[model samples]
Target: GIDPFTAEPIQFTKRIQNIVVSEHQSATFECEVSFDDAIVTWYKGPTELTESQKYNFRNDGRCHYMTIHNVTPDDEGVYSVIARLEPRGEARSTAELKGELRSGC
Candidate 1:
């Protein structure tokens, strides 16, 4: 739907689904958006994710990626990626992880 006279800008696009992984394995959540001007963020539950030894984040053009290495029981939950465009516009996607694992995050 368009207003025809006053056109609105297209912000972002994201397509994602549930992801299941094995214990002590890796899980990846990918996000797709065309604009680099937008701010991208990743979250596991209520906590935001940052780059570390176990967690990695990267953005290559339209494809944004988040990887969790050596995943365990603590990592079993819903993961999400959000892209914030200007003026309160946002694009988001969510995926779920489920599996039993050793003591880890």
Candidate 2:
């Protein structure tokens, strides 16, 4: 069941993958959209992340990226990116970051 008349292909050019990072380190997550005019938004779990000292957000037409500085165990969660086409279509990709475990003395 395909509606050819209302079909607008909105997809991610690049998908987000699982990433592992050590505590007190930096991590990056990126999402690329097929459409240049697509709107991109990033979220950490249910909270939205905007450009700040802890979070760096950048958008260059086709791709969007966010870098988390000084990552901690609390930062370990699913990061999602949503891209919306001009009219209706939307696509999303997510990546999970797990903090590396360390042994106690």
Candidate 3:
């Protein structure tokens, strides 16, 4: 069954969205998960970004922060954050970053 809000196929969940980033720029993404039990993740393009890197990933309560540092042309692409609830529940959203990356902050 679909929600009465839209006239289209019903998606049991809304997850695995993407974000866009430009060259040489800093960016961040936030993941919101419902319920206390769920698995959350962030991704850049087709690769899964590590939790500890030049970027930072922090989970404060229900808010998950995904950040990047010293962006570049290669960094310009789709960024996605996925959250999965226990069993088989999930939701996700993406934000697009529009700009060019810089050499410095």
| Best of the candidates, lDDT | 2
Candidate 3 residue lDDT tens string, 1-105: 654432222221334344445555567776555443445677676788885568788877656777887666556677777766433534545555455534566
- Candidate 2 residues 1-105, lDDT tens each? 765533477788789888888786788887777677777788888798887667888888888888888778988989988887656567878889889776578
Best by TM-score: 2
Clashes of 1: 0
In model 1, which residue pairs have backbone atoms overlapping below 3 Å? none
Candidate 2 has a TM-score of 0.82
lDDT of 1 at 18: 74
The C-alpha TM-scores of every prediction are 0.77, 0.82, 0.63
The candidate with the higher lDDT, 1 or 3, is 1
Please report the TM-score between candidate 1 and the true structure. Answer: 0.77
**After TM-score superposition, what is the CA distance of residue 92 in candidate 1 from its true location, in Å?**
2.4
**Which regions in candidate 3 have their CA more than 4 angstroms from the true location?**
1-25, 101-105
Model 3 RMSD in Å is 6.3
Give the per-residue lDDT of model 1 (tens digit) for 1-105.
645422234334556667777786788887777666667888889999998787888888778888888777777889888877655445667889877545666
Please report, in order, the local distance difference test score of every candidate based on alpha carbons. 0.74, 0.80, 0.60
